[PDB]
Design a protein around this ligand. Structure first.
Ligand SMILES: NC(=O)c1ccc[n+]([C@@H]2O[C@H](COP(=O)([O-])OP(=O)(O)OC[C@H]3O[C@@H](n4cnc5c(N)ncnc54)[C@H](O)[C@@H]3O)[C@@H](O)[C@H]2O)c1
Ligand SMILES: NC(=O)c1ccc[n+]([C@@H]2O[C@H](COP(=O)([O-])OP(=O)(O)OC[C@H]3O[C@@H](n4cnc5c(N)ncnc54)[C@H](O)[C@@H]3O)[C@@H](O)[C@H]2O)c1
Lengths: 331, 7, 331, 7
């Protein structure tokens, strides 16, 4: 009578429920792993709501008997094999932009915490660092640089990337971006400098920030080789996808000093920990629990959206009844 | 609202 | 033959020297206190270069026999009794704006670290806080709010204050200011909302930031009374002068929760320490070593300026030869 | 460049 929809990696349906209360049987598995999923869920689940803390390979998808649509609560669908998925007959959707602002703001924040060193200043005082004379101030703050004039290198001028550029120009930054798959002319409309190769950007940048969607071509975009293409004491800010940066190469660069600092909200291995991993002992390093997207408003907003998508399906028709599908051309 | 968590 | 100039609170004249090398005998006292000053300095010192880590009351000034001009390396001259000073025949100058950008940026930074909680997220991970599911993310980040729409209350629309408003609008903030001594119409030119009373601002603000020069009227501007005029869970950012906020009232508010957070670069009692003072155990608290102004570029820039002022005097004529005097009308 | 620090 009423199809079944399961919240794979989670156990809170308070928001989605009011929208699927009469068109589905919402339940939760809270399966941090692809195998921790309940049997009957893998058997009788017309739809599925999932976040990011769980990936789905073809090997996994082929286990879902009744699955026909997967809704990713967020703008990132790299943890899902949208292709193998599509070819299997299961539609995959995403929430285009519900936390673009949240991330843009949080991004500029990490950038400021590097240039202004406000995060380390606090931490320093929190440990008994006594600062008396202006002499000491220049010491504890030794590193704080002026932003006026500095060139902000942006890799990926998407929803988030663009928001960052608007805020970037406000601080006097000399913004310039790189986006191969982006249409020509957009730079003019936004009044921004556009390079044609990653090599050019890293060469003309004092601070590089990642805002590109992870895929098969940009994996490990930042590696020992591309790092050599960067400038000395250049800053790095990654609030996109952990696979974009080679934690080992960065950990090495940070230590050698070829990179004056780094801010990371996303990491290769999540959850992240300053104890395990290449960045185990990396200098000048700021990290956040992949929460740049968080906001009580943005959270509910994206969840209510995904909830609608699930209903546009159970009620409408796949895929012509889906507003935000990512494989409408793969099946 | 259904607890489909593997026990 | 060559007048004497002394760097009261410091001991580095590498920057100023190249400008006073032929017109004065530059020396340093590094007197963190008004009494630690060398005798001969208080006797034969035509000029004097000082920062902020030392105040000068009439009682002090009347001790300088040959002193005729005091140059404050910075835009703050609240630590000097410019009046009693002027009436004594000693001119007092300042560096109008050499770190306006540095402070504006650092200010927005503290604002972002509150709204985005990027500083506490890092600190949290730095202590072993493990974040797995999105569930936990909303917990550790429980507090991160959306900026789009929020009203930024600005008290004092000066050089720094204005820079903050330009950056503020970039993030979607609904900026509004209060500046009694400010000329009428400026709000129109900058396209900003202007209230006429402190009560109005604190009433229409979600985040209040101080950017007004400390004096005899605004001392303890923020007190238990004015705090009651603020909103619930409102944010506070003070990167101006410590005397502006009553550490006790704030410490109480923070604890009670009437204030969701606070960022302070300046404190009543400097140097600052999370161990001693009212904020000994205050929740949601970010503090910096009065370094929002720091920048290798801004530091040398302001010092070279003060250096010139000292020369425009020793070479020119007081006060009509001073570009940035603050008591030209008191003597 | 003169050390006028009270000893
Ligand atoms: N840290 C977080 O919590 C968080 C917050 C929001 C989004 N996500 C991540 O943010 C990133 C961007 O999100 P968005 O909404 O702006 O995405 P879009 O809206 O996907 O923007 C990304 C842009 O990157 C470009 N791009 C793709 N591959 C590229 C490559 N190899 N080199 C250069 N540019 C490339 C695209 O053409 C696109 O315009 C994604 O990786 C997404 O997964 C994470
Ligand atoms: N934290 C730091 O390291 C740092 C950095 C730069 C400057 N300073 C401090 O920054 C503050 C502002 O600097 P600025 O360069 O913009 O100064 P201005 O350039 O002096 O700006 C301050 C503005 O405050 C207004 N004002 C004065 N009294 C006021 C009151 N009671 N209420 C409301 N407005 C009032 C003035 O009319 C003026 O336009 C000062 O207090 C200064 O001492 C500190």
């Amino acid at each position: 009578p009423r199809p079944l929809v399961a919240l794979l990696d989670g156990r809170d349906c308070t928001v989605e429920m009011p929208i699927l209360k009469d068109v589905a049987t919402v339940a939760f598995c809270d399966a941090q792993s692809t195998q921790e999923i309940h049997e009957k869920v893998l058997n009788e689940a017309v739809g599925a709501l999932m976040y990011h803390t769980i990936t789905l390979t073809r090997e996994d998808l082929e286990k879902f008997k009744a699955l026909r649509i997967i809704v990713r609560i967020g703008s990132g669908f790299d943890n899902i094999d949208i292709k193998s998925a599509g070819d299997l007959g299961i539609a995959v959707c995403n929430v285009p932009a519900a936390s673009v602002e949240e991330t843009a703001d949080s991004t500029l924040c990490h950038i400021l915490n590097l240039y202004r060193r406000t995060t380390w200043l606090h931490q320093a005082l929190r440990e008994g660092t006594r600062v008396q004379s202006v002499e000491q101030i220049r010491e504890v703050a030794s590193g704080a640089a002026r932003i006026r004039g500095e060139t902000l290198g942006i890799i990926g001028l998407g929803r988030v990337g663009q928001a960052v550029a608007l805020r970037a120009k406000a601080f006097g930054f000399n913004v310039l971006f790189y986006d191969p798959y982006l249409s020509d002319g957009i730079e003019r409309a936004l009044g921004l400098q556009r390079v044609s190769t990653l090599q050019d950007l890293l060469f003309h940048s004092d601070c590089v920030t990642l805002h590109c969607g992870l895929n098969e071509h940009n994996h490990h975009l930042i590696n020992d080789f591309t790092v050599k293409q960067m400038r000395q004491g250049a800053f790095l800010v990654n609030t996109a996808r952990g696979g974009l940066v080679d934690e080992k190469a960065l950990a090495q660069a940070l230590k050698e000093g070829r990179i004056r600092g780094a801010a990371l909200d996303v990491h290769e291995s999540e959850p992240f920990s300053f104890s395990q991993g290449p960045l185990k002992d990396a200098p000048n390093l700021i990290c956040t629990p992949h929460a740049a997207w968080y906001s009580e408003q943005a959270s509910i907003e994206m969840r209510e959206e995904a909830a609608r998508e699930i209903r546009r399906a159970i009620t409408g028709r796949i895929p012509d009844s889906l507003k935000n599908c990512v494989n409408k051309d793969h099946l | 609202p259904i607890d489909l968590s593997k026990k």
